[PDB]
Amino acid sequence: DFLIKSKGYLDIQTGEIIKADLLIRNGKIAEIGKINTKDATVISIPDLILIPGLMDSHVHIVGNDSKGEESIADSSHMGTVWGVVNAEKTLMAGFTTVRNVGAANYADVSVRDAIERGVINGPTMLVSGPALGITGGHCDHNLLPPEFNYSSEGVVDSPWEARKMVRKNRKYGADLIKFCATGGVMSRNTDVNAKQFTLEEMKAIVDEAHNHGMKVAAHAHGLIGIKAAIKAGVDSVEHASFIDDETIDMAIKNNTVLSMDIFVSDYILGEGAKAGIREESLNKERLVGKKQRENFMNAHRRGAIITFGTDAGIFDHGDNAKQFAYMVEWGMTPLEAIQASTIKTATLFGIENIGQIKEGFDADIVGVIENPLANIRTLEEVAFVMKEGKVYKR
Amino acid sequence: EDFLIKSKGYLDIQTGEIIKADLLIRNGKIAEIGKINTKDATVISIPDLILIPGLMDSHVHIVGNDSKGEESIADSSHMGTVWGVVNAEKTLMAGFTTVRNVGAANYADVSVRDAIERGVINGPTMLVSGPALGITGGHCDHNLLPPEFNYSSEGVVDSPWEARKMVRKNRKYGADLIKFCATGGVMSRNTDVNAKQFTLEEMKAIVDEAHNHGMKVAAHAHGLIGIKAAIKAGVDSVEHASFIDDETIDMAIKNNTVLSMDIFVSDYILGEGAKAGIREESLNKERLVGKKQRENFMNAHRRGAIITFGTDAGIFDHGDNAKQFAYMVEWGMTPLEAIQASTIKTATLFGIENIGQIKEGFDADIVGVIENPLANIRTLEEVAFVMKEGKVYKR
Amino acid sequence: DFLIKSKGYLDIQTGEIIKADLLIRNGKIAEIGKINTKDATVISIPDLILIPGLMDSHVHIVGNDSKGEESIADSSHMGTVWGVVNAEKTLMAGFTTVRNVGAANYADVSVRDAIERGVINGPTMLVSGPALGITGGHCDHNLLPPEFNYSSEGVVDSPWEARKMVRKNRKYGADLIKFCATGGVMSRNTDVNAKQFTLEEMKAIVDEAHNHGMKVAAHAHGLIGIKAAIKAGVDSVEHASFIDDETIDMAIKNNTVLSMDIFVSDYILGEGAKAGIREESLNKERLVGKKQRENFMNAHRRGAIITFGTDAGIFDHGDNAKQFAYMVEWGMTPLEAIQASTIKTATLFGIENIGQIKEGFDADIVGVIENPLANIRTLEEVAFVMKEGKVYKR
Amino acid sequence: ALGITGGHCDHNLLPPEFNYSSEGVVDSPWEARKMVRKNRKYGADLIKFCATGGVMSRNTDVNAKQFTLEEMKAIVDEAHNHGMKVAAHAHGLIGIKAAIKAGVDSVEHASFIDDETIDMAIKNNTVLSMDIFVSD
Ligand SMILES: NC(=[NH2+])NCCC[C@H](N)C(=O)O
Ligand SMILES: NC(=[NH2+])NCCC[C@H](N)C(=O)O
Ligand SMILES: NC(=[NH2+])NCCC[C@H](N)C(=O)O
Ligand SMILES: NC(=[NH2+])NCCC[C@H](N)C(=O)O
Ligand SMILES: [Zn+2]
Ligand SMILES: [Zn+2]
Ligand SMILES: [Zn+2]
Ligand SMILES: [Zn+2]
Ligand SMILES: [Zn+2]
Ligand SMILES: [Zn+2]
Ligand SMILES: [Zn+2]
Ligand SMILES: [Zn+2]
Ligand SMILES: [Zn+2]
Ligand SMILES: [Zn+2]
Ligand SMILES: [Zn+2]
Ligand SMILES: [Zn+2]
Ligand SMILES: [Zn+2]
């Protein structure tokens, strides 16, 4: 049992700093206010303001981050090694629950299960397994000559094939299903504006996933794909870069969350240009970047649900909180930006008893130096992290 | 040669009346009822015993490996066949003369069935399903190996035409009926009991093809949404039916959908099975299912739904099937209704005539028992005389 | 414990009937003499003479015995069902240890393990797994058209292929290795007098098997294959139908046991002719039958070790004891015939503590009506069977 | 690790219907040669093989030799050609002899090593890597 004495805590619903102590037992926030101090151990942390543990709705924790010629023939296990490292970095940054949204060989379930079993430290991961795509789509790997005839793990090309891949992902322990509805920036030979998958295929994916109580995320930059994903019944649209007034309203009507990664565009065009990102990808980034944040601002105003998704993996894991500054700059209040990373994500994830400092809820608590409603860039350097009643950072 | 059964009196399963008579048995049928011209050959003098028709179980798994421990880990599938021989005898000796085997691999169930039929081994007449059909990762699938193995079990199908083909394949290799998983289950790893498995289109395809070949369809379904779908697809029986509500009990009544409910086996799983080697995930899913199923069993009987005697023997010991009768009367059936559920009700479900009744022309599947079963139903738990097809197997 | 009081017991070495009691503890014969019936519990069988449990060195317990058109498309599991039936029949006939010498799919290890676990009743089986043969050999199944290109489980065609099949059999639990060194009677398109396998292949089979502590049996009718099998170093030659003076001496020198089935030829030409045995097989039986028993007589005289192998499976399981009468008629004393089925087999099998009613040995004991040295045909109907301290027949 | 079909390095935990053999299973000198080459291809520093049965595996005789000497020599020759060292798992005496005779750089466990073959190891610079603690 822990008793947490602090400068106060953010009531995320109201936007209030409230001065109270927190009693923690069985990894849950047991009690809030003045508590009987005779009992057990005390976390004296009186200068820090406490916020609920942060959430990212779009990460790629597992994957090889080694670069250069020496890493060319690396096995898939190197990506699992990197997953361990990056899971720690994500948690230490104050992110306690994340949505891993594409990985190969179910190494994402392995890292998730290892965290859950307390083998390694990291956030609670909700994992997708291999993302589902058409032949030659964004989800497919178009880097080998046709003599190889290589298609990646999640490539499906009929409603029933798609159905079966959803079933196979669930079999090997996926929490959600992810699919590419358009082309993308980071892949080779994909049109960002063209729709990938027929609506029948998209509907089959969504129907099957929901039947198993799994939520569906859809990668979609181009407008025609965003429309189709919403119409198919997805729970979130990732990126949503060219969303217009009419289909923002479609999303509002259908409770479709818009998981928009407005920060990562600056990394790709700046730091990523000489990091090793291809020339074809940088040109597709120009088409997407500036237009996405304009649409982000419009979508928020019109009233669409937007979550905090960063596409961490492209940029460094642990730097996820840099998106908060971008989020307020493009039309959100500091409170709204933090709500997008807590209560909004919680609903999207379909997990209750997280995202709020409230009695009964899980003890996922982040301590921060300044007031986050005054300066949101304090989230970029957190000073206390507790996940499930365990302290990982001081 | 002919036999004369001098009994304390047989039970007319239609009426409830212990009609005192004698029975002449020739060619494996009941030829004469009443006082007969004692003409021919030998006399089965067994006058302490009340006579009932041979008992039926609509849900068994006779073939399967019952060996436990580390020593049995790399056993071939033939061990499950060996056990099948053992368990077939144990089933017949417990007074069950016709059973419906409802899920087995490699058509070993048709091999055991045929062996019994050929007189190679002793056991009940089996109606066999072959491999049960299920989706990838479903209850019918084996979810115990790593993804690297990419293992899916025999009856895994994932499209209406794949499903169609599997029904045809089972028929090709000698199946009598078709069985499929409509929801997740208790005993499997990584299955949601509440969630539906298969699309309705898939289910309808299975049913349509099976019925086209004169095969009946059983559907494993715990969750309500899958029970609805199975009935709507047109199955002949819903196994378990654990979360069936008022509305869909009426659906079943309207469509002649039998409810094959296993109310006994839950006590074995939570009690004896907890230390026997049943996984922690399975025991938690049993607590969700068990108590609620029997409440729904009581409600379904009262609303007027056809319920058969199905035990899920294989989980518990084969031979102990008759233990469910006590549970059956306790949960709203009369002693007569519980025996009817194991005789006439099952015979219709099985689609076999000339069985389930002590009547002239019917098959000589006759069980002798000590006390009156309408007085004490637990006498069925220890039968003293078993005749199957005019041959005596127990005295 | 068990205290067996009988008329007496056959001393298998001397041929005398010793009067004593037999104390049984933990499956072994603990004491032989006048024994204080002390703790427990007495088996009074005063009319019966006790002999060691009988052995067969050549059986096929697992295999489909169903005939007619209805059995044509039977799965291999029907052979397993029949295996259960035939194991019981073998044990009730007073055979407590047998050597099963060819079966498919490791169904023989399944039946053996089921008996060992006490799931079913039967003798202790020593099993071979699939017999090794060349393409188109006696061990191969030559009943399908060439379009099918079917070769059976144990077909090997190089020394390293043969090595690997031995290793594979051991992996899936075989006790011994069996191979075809010549063509046979019961197969289609095989020359009985032609050698199958090169010597190099034969030597590789034997070397690998011996390296693992497995014994090697070789099916060999034709003289030239018998020679080769002995030269390769086999522990037994099955059938050995055309063995001459020179190679009988080869067998004596090398301790090569001759497992000869003299009875079964009368079944094949008589009962089997109408049972469904093909015309090509009956003609090859006429070449083998009469000549084999003449050679059996010569080999015994010259001093070669001959065990009791019947080829049960062709004829009915349980009728194994009929070979005893044939065995005395062709040059053995009644004692020598029973010795061939007890002490001789035990050595061949490589199992100690069986085959003798002796202190420390296993309680494999058969009770019989008359004296077996007076009338050997009492073995054809035994009255008492105990295997490993358990009574199966009274 | 390289091993025979059904050996200590093989995994004998599945039914014969699966026909599963593990990654390093080799059953001829040239197969063995190839697996050494494959291991080197994907970055191995040394080669390890099972020369006898072991404790922790299912269905293996600890005192029986696994691999022919020819196979063993092929493994060692090929590894040495690439400047890789060879370790050999060996409990039983008859396998330890063979591994030394084949020219391994170390014998792992070496549980039943006698006077004569300790001298063989000394003469050949064969290191004995012995795990005396783990049995407790
Ligand atoms: N707003 C952005 N440009 N985000 C980057 C998109 C990255 C995404 N994985 C793709 O390849 O399409
Ligand atoms: N009353 C019961 N618990 N019935 C369910 C028995 C187990 C069932 N075959 C399953 O795994 O789903
Ligand atoms: N002595 C004999 N009858 N030998 C022939 C027995 C049949 C033997 N299994 C074969 O086909 O060769
Ligand atoms: N006494 C010992 N060192 N025992 C442990 C041996 C471990 C080795 N991996 C084996 O199973 O063979
Ligand atoms: Zn958590
Ligand atoms: Zn994307
Ligand atoms: Zn992404
Ligand atoms: Zn706002
Ligand atoms: Zn019948
Ligand atoms: Zn079920
Ligand atoms: Zn069942
Ligand atoms: Zn009633
Ligand atoms: Zn024995
Ligand atoms: Zn033969
Ligand atoms: Zn034979
Ligand atoms: Zn003699
Ligand atoms: Zn080792």
JSON list of N, CA, C and O in Angstrom, two decimals, chain C residues 71-86:
[
{"chain": "C", "resi": 71, "resn": "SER", "atom": "N", "xyz": [-15.20, -53.35, -46.04]},
{"chain": "C", "resi": 71, "resn": "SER", "atom": "CA", "xyz": [-13.99, -52.97, -45.32]},
{"chain": "C", "resi": 71, "resn": "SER", "atom": "C", "xyz": [-12.93, -52.28, -46.20]},
{"chain": "C", "resi": 71, "resn": "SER", "atom": "O", "xyz": [-11.84, -51.97, -45.71]},
{"chain": "C", "resi": 72, "resn": "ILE", "atom": "N", "xyz": [-13.26, -52.05, -47.46]},
{"chain": "C", "resi": 72, "resn": "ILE", "atom": "CA", "xyz": [-12.27, -51.60, -48.45]},
{"chain": "C", "resi": 72, "resn": "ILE", "atom": "C", "xyz": [-11.69, -50.21, -48.20]},
{"chain": "C", "resi": 72, "resn": "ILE", "atom": "O", "xyz": [-10.50, -49.97, -48.46]},
{"chain": "C", "resi": 73, "resn": "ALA", "atom": "N", "xyz": [-12.50, -49.30, -47.66]},
{"chain": "C", "resi": 73, "resn": "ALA", "atom": "CA", "xyz": [-12.08, -47.92, -47.46]},
{"chain": "C", "resi": 73, "resn": "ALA", "atom": "C", "xyz": [-11.94, -47.59, -45.98]},
{"chain": "C", "resi": 73, "resn": "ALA", "atom": "O", "xyz": [-12.11, -46.43, -45.56]},
{"chain": "C", "resi": 74, "resn": "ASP", "atom": "N", "xyz": [-11.65, -48.63, -45.19]},
{"chain": "C", "resi": 74, "resn": "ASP", "atom": "CA", "xyz": [-11.44, -48.50, -43.76]},
{"chain": "C", "resi": 74, "resn": "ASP", "atom": "C", "xyz": [-10.19, -47.69, -43.47]},
{"chain": "C", "resi": 74, "resn": "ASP", "atom": "O", "xyz": [-9.19, -47.84, -44.17]},
{"chain": "C", "resi": 75, "resn": "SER", "atom": "N", "xyz": [-10.25, -46.84, -42.45]},
{"chain": "C", "resi": 75, "resn": "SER", "atom": "CA", "xyz": [-9.07, -46.08, -42.07]},
{"chain": "C", "resi": 75, "resn": "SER", "atom": "C", "xyz": [-8.11, -46.98, -41.31]},
{"chain": "C", "resi": 75, "resn": "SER", "atom": "O", "xyz": [-8.44, -48.12, -40.97]},
{"chain": "C", "resi": 76, "resn": "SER", "atom": "N", "xyz": [-6.91, -46.47, -41.05]},
{"chain": "C", "resi": 76, "resn": "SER", "atom": "CA", "xyz": [-5.90, -47.22, -40.32]},
{"chain": "C", "resi": 76, "resn": "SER", "atom": "C", "xyz": [-6.33, -47.46, -38.87]},
{"chain": "C", "resi": 76, "resn": "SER", "atom": "O", "xyz": [-5.83, -48.37, -38.21]},
{"chain": "C", "resi": 77, "resn": "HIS", "atom": "N", "xyz": [-7.28, -46.65, -38.38]},
{"chain": "C", "resi": 77, "resn": "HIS", "atom": "CA", "xyz": [-7.79, -46.78, -37.02]},
{"chain": "C", "resi": 77, "resn": "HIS", "atom": "C", "xyz": [-8.55, -48.07, -36.77]},
{"chain": "C", "resi": 77, "resn": "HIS", "atom": "O", "xyz": [-8.62, -48.52, -35.63]},
{"chain": "C", "resi": 78, "resn": "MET", "atom": "N", "xyz": [-9.10, -48.68, -37.82]},
{"chain": "C", "resi": 78, "resn": "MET", "atom": "CA", "xyz": [-9.73, -49.99, -37.72]},
{"chain": "C", "resi": 78, "resn": "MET", "atom": "C", "xyz": [-8.70, -51.06, -37.36]},
{"chain": "C", "resi": 78, "resn": "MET", "atom": "O", "xyz": [-8.98, -51.97, -36.59]},
{"chain": "C", "resi": 79, "resn": "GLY", "atom": "N", "xyz": [-7.49, -50.93, -37.91]},
{"chain": "C", "resi": 79, "resn": "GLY", "atom": "CA", "xyz": [-6.38, -51.82, -37.55]},
{"chain": "C", "resi": 79, "resn": "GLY", "atom": "C", "xyz": [-6.00, -51.71, -36.09]},
{"chain": "C", "resi": 79, "resn": "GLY", "atom": "O", "xyz": [-5.64, -52.71, -35.46]},
{"chain": "C", "resi": 80, "resn": "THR", "atom": "N", "xyz": [-6.08, -50.50, -35.54]},
{"chain": "C", "resi": 80, "resn": "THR", "atom": "CA", "xyz": [-5.84, -50.26, -34.12]},
{"chain": "C", "resi": 80, "resn": "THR", "atom": "C", "xyz": [-6.94, -50.91, -33.25]},
{"chain": "C", "resi": 80, "resn": "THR", "atom": "O", "xyz": [-6.63, -51.54, -32.25]},
{"chain": "C", "resi": 81, "resn": "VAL", "atom": "N", "xyz": [-8.21, -50.76, -33.65]},
{"chain": "C", "resi": 81, "resn": "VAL", "atom": "CA", "xyz": [-9.34, -51.39, -32.94]},
{"chain": "C", "resi": 81, "resn": "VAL", "atom": "C", "xyz": [-9.13, -52.90, -32.87]},
{"chain": "C", "resi": 81, "resn": "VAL", "atom": "O", "xyz": [-9.21, -53.50, -31.80]},
{"chain": "C", "resi": 82, "resn": "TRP", "atom": "N", "xyz": [-8.81, -53.49, -34.02]},
{"chain": "C", "resi": 82, "resn": "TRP", "atom": "CA", "xyz": [-8.49, -54.90, -34.10]},
{"chain": "C", "resi": 82, "resn": "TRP", "atom": "C", "xyz": [-7.29, -55.27, -33.25]},
{"chain": "C", "resi": 82, "resn": "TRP", "atom": "O", "xyz": [-7.24, -56.38, -32.71]},
{"chain": "C", "resi": 83, "resn": "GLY", "atom": "N", "xyz": [-6.33, -54.35, -33.14]},
{"chain": "C", "resi": 83, "resn": "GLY", "atom": "CA", "xyz": [-5.16, -54.55, -32.30]},
{"chain": "C", "resi": 83, "resn": "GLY", "atom": "C", "xyz": [-5.53, -54.79, -30.85]},
{"chain": "C", "resi": 83, "resn": "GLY", "atom": "O", "xyz": [-4.96, -55.68, -30.22]},
{"chain": "C", "resi": 84, "resn": "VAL", "atom": "N", "xyz": [-6.49, -54.02, -30.33]},
{"chain": "C", "resi": 84, "resn": "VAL", "atom": "CA", "xyz": [-7.00, -54.18, -28.97]},
{"chain": "C", "resi": 84, "resn": "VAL", "atom": "C", "xyz": [-7.61, -55.58, -28.74]},
{"chain": "C", "resi": 84, "resn": "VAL", "atom": "O", "xyz": [-7.29, -56.25, -27.76]},
{"chain": "C", "resi": 85, "resn": "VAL", "atom": "N", "xyz": [-8.47, -56.01, -29.67]},
{"chain": "C", "resi": 85, "resn": "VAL", "atom": "CA", "xyz": [-9.09, -57.33, -29.63]},
{"chain": "C", "resi": 85, "resn": "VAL", "atom": "C", "xyz": [-8.05, -58.46, -29.65]},
{"chain": "C", "resi": 85, "resn": "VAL", "atom": "O", "xyz": [-8.13, -59.40, -28.85]},
{"chain": "C", "resi": 86, "resn": "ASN", "atom": "N", "xyz": [-7.08, -58.34, -30.55]},
{"chain": "C", "resi": 86, "resn": "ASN", "atom": "CA", "xyz": [-6.08, -59.37, -30.75]},
{"chain": "C", "resi": 86, "resn": "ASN", "atom": "C", "xyz": [-5.03, -59.44, -29.65]},
{"chain": "C", "resi": 86, "resn": "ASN", "atom": "O", "xyz": [-4.47, -60.51, -29.41]}
]
